[PDB]
Write a protein that binds this ligand. Structure first.
Ligand SMILES: [Ca+2]
Ligand SMILES: [Ca+2]
Length: 395
């Protein structure tokens, strides 16, 4: 039988373009440690974690990252945060959470924005889905606290791989690789940090001092996901994005750098269709366009750089200067000038790259929870009668 509408995200993958820095071949002689390998490889993408080893696209009990996924590849009151329009007649899809924290999509038929509602083959990555008409819906008065939506705060590190290692990385150059992704998952209602993930191209041993500091701050112990190539890492990040499905996503300059870089790699280098990687399982919007906008269906992208430049007056809006100014937190900064020499040194030094990548995402979380931009944007979305996505990206 299978799904009525085809899922277009990778639920399976048995061959891919393998691109990796040759310096990770710590067993190879120096004459062959320069540049990147770039070829095809006929095996399933895989991820390593703490000595254990899994296929990236396998779903089961032993997963290295959290999921909020009912369906994978077809295998098996509410609060609305976002609304999709699609054709089946025009169907209006309300995306949301119940008080229990189940993900819902309610498909409203017969038509020709943020708050609680009452009711009176899935098209999406939800736990339950409903067909109804607009008369089956009413605003649930007396409910105003946000359900347990999830925020993903993320940051990429890139490494230019051409004859100048200090050159600004260009996504269209196959040898300019994403080498790490920090991915911090928070509960948006309680503000609790629930997971600290570091995606790493190559082996990566975070330092004891960093692990002890996070433990002393009472924060979750980081999970390091190690990968042999850029595609396996990018596929796994997108797999987490689809499987965990953070309703809100934040970062610093993620709209003008991180998202455009990732999506350029995924689209141009690897030929991965992005239209099933949002909330919808295929034929959904997932696009960056030019400073940039972004639309990912079912995901609210909030760039803290935009929020902060709009809100504080500063001599510099570099994340470090902002952290010193706003949080009073004097972050020590790893230079982009350091990254190539550290990356080539071994898993301990790639661990130092990892620490600073995690610390960056942690500051952006603190900034996020200070300004609470989602509260400002949802308030405007309610008042102005438009969805929160359009509230951000339209004038
Ligand atoms: Ca960033
Ligand atoms: Ca960074």
């Amino acid at each position: 039988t299978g799904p009525t509408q085809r899922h277009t995200y990778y639920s399976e993958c048995d061959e891919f373009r393998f691109i990796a820095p040759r310096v990770l071949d710590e067993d190879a002689p120096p004459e062959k440690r320069a540049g990147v390998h770039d070829g095809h490889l006929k095996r399933a993408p895989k991820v390593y974690c703490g000595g254990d080893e899994r296929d990236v696209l396998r779903v089961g009990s032993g997963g290295f990252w959290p999921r909020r996924s009912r369906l994978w590849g077809g295998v098996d009151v509410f609060h609305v945060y976002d609304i999709l329009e699609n054709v089946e007649g025009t169907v209006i899809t309300l995306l949301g959470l119940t008080p229990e924290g189940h993900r819902v999509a309610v498909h409203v038929y017969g038509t020709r924005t943020f708050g609680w509602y009452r009711l009176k083959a899935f098209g999406t990555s939800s736990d339950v889905e409903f067909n109804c008409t607009a008369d089956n819906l009413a605003i649930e008065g007396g409910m105003s606290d946000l359900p347990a939506y999830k925020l993903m705060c993320f940051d990429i590190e890139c490494k230019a791989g051409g004859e100048d290692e200090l050159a600004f990385p260009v996504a269209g150059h196959p040898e300019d690789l994403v080498i790490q992704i920090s991915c911090l998952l928070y509960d948006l209602s309680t503000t609790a940090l629930e997971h600290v993930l570091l995606f790493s191209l190559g082996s990566c041993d975070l330092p004891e001092s960093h692990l002890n500091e996070l433990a002393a701050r009472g924060l979750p112990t980081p999970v390091v996901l190690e990968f042999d190539s850029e595609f396996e890492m990018l596929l796994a990040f997108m797999t987490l994005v689809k499987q965990y499905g953070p309703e809100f996503v934040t970062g610093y300059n993620i709209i003008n750098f991180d998202w455009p870089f990732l999506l350029a790699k995924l689209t141009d280098i690897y030929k991965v269709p992005l239209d099933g990687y949002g909330r919808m399982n295929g034929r959904g919007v997932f696009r960056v366009w030019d400073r940039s906008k972004i639309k990912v269906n079912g995901m609210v992208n909030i760039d803290m750089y935009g929020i902060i430049t709009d809100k504080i007056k500063l001599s510099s809006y570099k994340l470090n200067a902002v952290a010193e100014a706003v949080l009073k937190d004097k972050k020590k900064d790893l230079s982009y000038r350091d990254i190539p020499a550290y990356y080539a040194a071994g898993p301990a030094q790639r661990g130092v790259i990892g620490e600073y990548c995690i610390q960056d995402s942690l500051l952006v979380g603190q900034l996020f929870f200070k300004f609470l931009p989602h509260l400002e944007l949802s308030a405007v979305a309610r008042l102005a009668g438009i969805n929160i996505t359009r509230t951000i990206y339209d004038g």
